[PDB]
């Protein structure tokens, strides 16, 4: 039954240090407007305009 089956186990470990982090997600892309006033966030740049 269930008691004596080969169970594959993976352990994931992590820690923090002064080195920058890596696996930070695929992130979001919108590309909504090319003519009107919006609030853009191009690679961490905050501002508004046309």
């Amino acid at each position: 039954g269930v008691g004596h089956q080969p169970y594959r186990v993976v352990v994931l470990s992590f820690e923090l240090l002064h080195a920058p982090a890596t696996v930070c997600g695929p992130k979001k892309s919108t590309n909504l407007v090319k003519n009107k006033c919006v609030n853009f966030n191009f690679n961490g740049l905050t501002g508004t305009g046309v």
Partner: protein, 41 residues
């Protein structure tokens, strides 16, 4: 880095050439000494 094959004859030529960025390394280690590899064996 920059590679410029404009030398004629000899010497460090008069002129002006800036350096573009090539790579960046996120390696936080203390640096104190420097050495060069001239591998001609």
């Amino acid at each position: 880095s920059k590679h410029t094959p404009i030398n004629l004859g000899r010497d460090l030529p008069q002129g002006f050439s800036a350096l573009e960025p090539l790579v960046d390394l996120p390696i936080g280690i203390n640096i104190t000494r420097f050495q060069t590899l001239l591998a001609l064996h």
